[PDB]
Structure 1
């Protein structure tokens, strides 16, 4: 679990979104595993606007933060799950690091702010759904 709160927006993994999120839906993309909903309260997370390939992510299955080198956002095949059939997830960044299903929603940050959230993993790898291209989150 986990979310990004910037201005009047809440960014979550689309597979973990609540009824409130869908009843206050701004944007959603199943190929990205992202859902953005409107909030009443003002959010303060700064989103990074960069091409960083190093950062730190929160791993709730270890209750620790981890420094990672990660790939550039791309189309990466994701094995069929209960939430989605077998498909290529877009805007996904991989890194060598620990992850477990309850880890989805873990924030990845660089020096410029929020890069993205944990969305995939397994076999000693962790995937992050990128949010730096979503320029409308600040306007």
Structure 2
């Protein structure tokens, strides 16, 4: 679990969104596993606007943060689950690192701020849904 709180927005994995998230929907994209809902309180997370390929992520299954090199956002094949059939997920970045399903939502951060959130993993790899292209999160 985990979310990004920026301005009047809450960014979460689409497969983990709640009833309240869907009742206050701003935007959702199944192909990216993202959903943004509105909030009454003000969020203070800074979103990075960069092309960094290094950062730190929070891994809840280990109660630890890990430094990683990650690939540029791209389409990556993702196995079927109870949330989606087998498909390509777009805007996904991979890193070598530990992850388990409950790790989804952990933030990936570089020196410029929030990069994305854990969205996939398996076999010593972890995938992050990128958020740096969502310029509207700021205005």
TM-score per shorter chain, which class?
Answer: over 0.9
Please identify runs of 4+ aligned residues in structure 1 that moved more than 6 A: none
Q: How far apart are the structure 2 equivalents of 1:41 and 1:106? A: 21
Deviations 1:62-94 (A, max 9, x none): 000000000000000001111000100000000
Partner of 2:59: 59
Q: How far apart are the structure 2 equivalents of 1:137 and 1:94? A: 23
User: What's the CA shift for 1:10?
Assistant: 0.1
User: What's the CA shift for 1:14?
Assistant: 0.1
User: What's the CA shift for 1:11?
Assistant: 0.1
Give the alignment's TM-score, normalised by structure 2: 1.00
Unaligned runs of 5+ in 1: none
Q: How far apart are the structure 1 equivalents of 2:43 and 2:4? A: 8
Partner of 2:48: 48
Secondary structure of the residue aligned to 2:68 is strand
Deviations 1:8-65 (A, max 9, x none): 0000000000000000000000000000000000000000000000000000000000
Q: How far apart are the structure 1 equivalents of 2:79 and 2:10? A: 27
Unaligned runs of 5+ in 2: none
Q: How far apart are the structure 1 equivalents of 2:106 and 2:122? A: 15
Q: How far apart are the structure 1 equivalents of 2:96 and 2:11? A: 24
The number of equivalent residue pairs is: 139
Give the alignment's TM-score, normalised by structure 1: 1.00
